[PDB]
Amino acid sequence: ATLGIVHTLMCHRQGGESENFAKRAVESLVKKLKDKRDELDALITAVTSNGIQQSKCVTIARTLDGRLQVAGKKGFPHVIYSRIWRWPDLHKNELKHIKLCKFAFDLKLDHVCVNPYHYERV
Amino acid sequence: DATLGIVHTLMCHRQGGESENFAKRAVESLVKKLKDKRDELDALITAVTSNGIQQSKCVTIARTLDGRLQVAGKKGFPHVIYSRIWRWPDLHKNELKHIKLCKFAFDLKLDHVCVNPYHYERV
DNA sequence: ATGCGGGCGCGCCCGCAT
DNA sequence: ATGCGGGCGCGCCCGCAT
Ligand SMILES: [Zn+2]
Ligand SMILES: [Zn+2]
């Protein structure tokens, strides 16, 4: 059942990462939201409507140094998912969170919002 | 750094059953674990450089949850790894039996595991 | 009913970029 | 000299051989 969800999210990718990298990052996030139906629904809504339909934060636990590893490569979780679904050429320090983003990376909370439509490019 | 001399003398006694990178990494890892265990580092050097003729006490490392130790991306049992490096280059998984005086043998399922290759026998 | 195995990531740490 | 990104290991996870 998560295969359908993963595939649907994968079709909205921009191609800034390898197929293996994007698949692994999407599967990892979906698994983290397994018992967070509201946040999984928010991600699907945000991604499949290309941000037109409003959504709440999609959060994952923050690691000791803030970085997330996917297929042997480390990076910030909000940059990883914003690079997958919105800016394929995205670099570090090119993101500013929106006013309504309660769990932004900049806020240095226990959890980090990875909703790509909760960030803006600079 | 003084540990270079120790890693070299222990490398001389390698049998060639593993790659240079694997042997170097495994020996460096063990030496680092014995950093504040002078008696156990001395026991290992004594055992290895005398080819087991000079008696030695147990050379122990902390046991991991599943017993396995990872070296250069490859997992295996710590007592089999070091027994393969200095004694039996063709050594496989359940080919080892500890000696009577081995107090921390793998087989005893204790907190610490003896990796002294001269504290085991082949079957 | 276990225990391999092997994939994979966070935490630790080294050695390399600055 | 030394802070920091990238390599690597133990723990977790899970399928399958034993
Ligand atoms: Zn948000
Ligand atoms: Zn022993």
Residue numbers in the entry:
A (entry chain A): 9 to 130
B (entry chain B): 8 to 130
Direct quotes from the study:
Smad proteins consist of an N-terminal MH1 domain, which binds to DNA, a linker region with phosphorylation sites for network regulatory inputs, and a C-terminal MH2 domain that is phosphorylated by the receptors and binds other Smad proteins, LDTFs, chromatin readers, and transcriptional co-activators and co-repressors. The receptors for TGF-β, nodal, activin, myostatin, and other family members are membrane serine/threonine kinases that phosphorylate and activate Smad2 and Smad3, whereas analogous receptors for the bone morphogenetic proteins (BMPs) preferentially phosphorylate and activate Smads 1, 5, and 8. These receptor-activated Smads (R-Smads) form heterotrimeric complexes with Smad4, which is required for the transcriptional regulation of most target genes. Focusing on the human and mouse Gsc promoter, here we identify specific Smad-binding GC-rich motifs and provide the X-ray crystal structures of Smad3 and Smad4 bound to several of these motifs.
We examined the recognition of the GGCGC site by the Smad4 MH1 domain of the Placozoa Trichoplax, metazoans whose bodies are composed by only four basic cell types and with one of the most divergent among the known Smad4 sequences relative to human Smad4. The crystal structure of the Trichoplax Smad4 MH1 domain bound to the GGCGC oligonucleotide reveals that this Smad4–DNA interaction is strictly conserved (diffraction data obtained at 2.43 Å, space group P212121, data collection, and statistics shown in Table 1). A superposition of the human Smad4 and Trichoplax Smad4 complexes shows that both complexes are very similar, and in particular the protein binding mode (Cα RMSD of 0.46 Å for 115 aligned residues). The X-ray crystal structure of Trichoplax adhaerens Smad4 MH1 bound to one of these motifs indicates a high conservation of this interaction in metazoans.
